[PDB]
Amino acid sequence: MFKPHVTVACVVHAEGKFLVVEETINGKALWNQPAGHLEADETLVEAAARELWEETGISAQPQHFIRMHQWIAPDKTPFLRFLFAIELEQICPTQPHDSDIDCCRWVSAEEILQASNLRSPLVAESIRCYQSGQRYPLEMIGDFNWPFTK
Ligand SMILES: [Mn+2]
């Protein structure tokens, strides 16, 4: 009985730049949104907040739902990738709390779209969705009748 991978991702935007995490993946350093897998008994939004803190040490809640991408991935691993947006007034200090992440870069949209090191092609698409002006309320993919304290 098929379940797919469920991951969350955030476009974090500040002073005309986007936040990107550098992960060395076999040998080379790749760029990604702060992003990861949903875990047990966790809201998509909570997830997105957690993986942000973990991969960058920013403390922020996702502000809107941009969109969700269903994609297969080169090694056939199936994904449902939830994409979110956070605007901050100014670039804020960062500190990854995860061994996976070499560092955080704040980078221009054109730099993302032009890059040859993106972790997946969804990293660039994410910027495109962002810049289209598309956003929606969290409530779009929100939790219904939830066992646990928010
Ligand atoms: Mn992670």
Ligand SMILES: [Mn+2]
């Ligand atoms: Mn994770």
